[PDB]
Amino acid sequence: SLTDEELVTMSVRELNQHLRGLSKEEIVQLKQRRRTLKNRGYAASCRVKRVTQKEELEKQKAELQQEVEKLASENASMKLELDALRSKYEALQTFARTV
Amino acid sequence: HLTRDELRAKALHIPFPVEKIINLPVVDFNEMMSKEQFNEAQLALIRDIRRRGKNKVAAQNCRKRKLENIVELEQDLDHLKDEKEKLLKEKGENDKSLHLLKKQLS
DNA sequence: CATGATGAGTCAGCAA
DNA sequence: GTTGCTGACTCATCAT
């Protein structure tokens, strides 16, 4: 007989060398079995690329998320310092106009 | 003509239509079930028709949520890139304002 | 028992 | 005819 891995990686031509002692229906069923194992791999490969794309999108999102949160936090912390400096700056200009 | 599930149900003398077996709400299904005297074969077929009918809806809903979740992730990436650009622009103007104030003060 | 979500596998049908 | 995809259905689980 033949295993699942041996059959799925077998080319069509190479499968023609493993027909010793098989009926016409046994050959058709063996090819149909190879097609089924092929479909099992197509489905698994289709799901690998979908998981790959999703995890890659969620990786960029998490990286940009912590990037944006740090930017928003540092911008707010610095805006406070700029408002305090500008507030003291305008008080000096106001005091200078008194002179 | 009659689907395979409809033929199986009538072959076991099930009086309900297949659409009713699948789509009746749980409460109406239980009370209807309680007014009958089914044997084990009949009960198992009714449950099998209902379970498969409901699960294939759950399977297609689950596939559609995967596609929608990808659209949301790409929307999330699009907004995050805009938010980062907006915060960088805000950080730039605030940097230029603070630099000049420190420069005028020498 | 009831229910719903989900990965893996299977089949059908498509385009190439 | 084969290949690679993919929507659809089903089973097997996990959870409430």
Numbering used by the authors:
A (entry chain A): 23 to 121
B (entry chain B): 453 to 558
Task: Give the original sentences from the paper that presented this experimental model.
Stabilized Nrf2 then translocates to the nucleus and forms heterodimers with sMaf proteins, thereby functioning as a transcriptional activator and upregulating the target genes involved in anti-stress responses. The co-crystal structures of Nrf2–MafG-CsMBE complexes show that the CNC motif stabilizes the conformation of Arg residues in the basic region in contact with DNA phosphates.
The DNA-binding domain of Nrf2 contains the N-terminal three short α-helices (α1–α3), followed by a large one (α4). Furthermore, α4 contains the basic region (residues 499–518) and the leucine zipper (residues 519–560), which mediate the interactions with DNA and MafG, respectively. Three Nrf2 residues (Asn507, Ala510, and Ala511) recognized the central TRE half site (positions 5–7, 5′-TGA-3′) in a manner similar to that of AP-1 proteins. The N-terminal side of the basic region of Nrf2 has three basic residues that contact DNA phosphates (Arg499, Arg502 and Arg504). In the crystal structure, the N7 atom of dA4, which is unique to purine bases, is recognized by Nrf2 Asn507 via water-mediated hydrogen bonds. The bridging water molecule is clearly visible in the electron density map of the CsMBE1 complex structure.
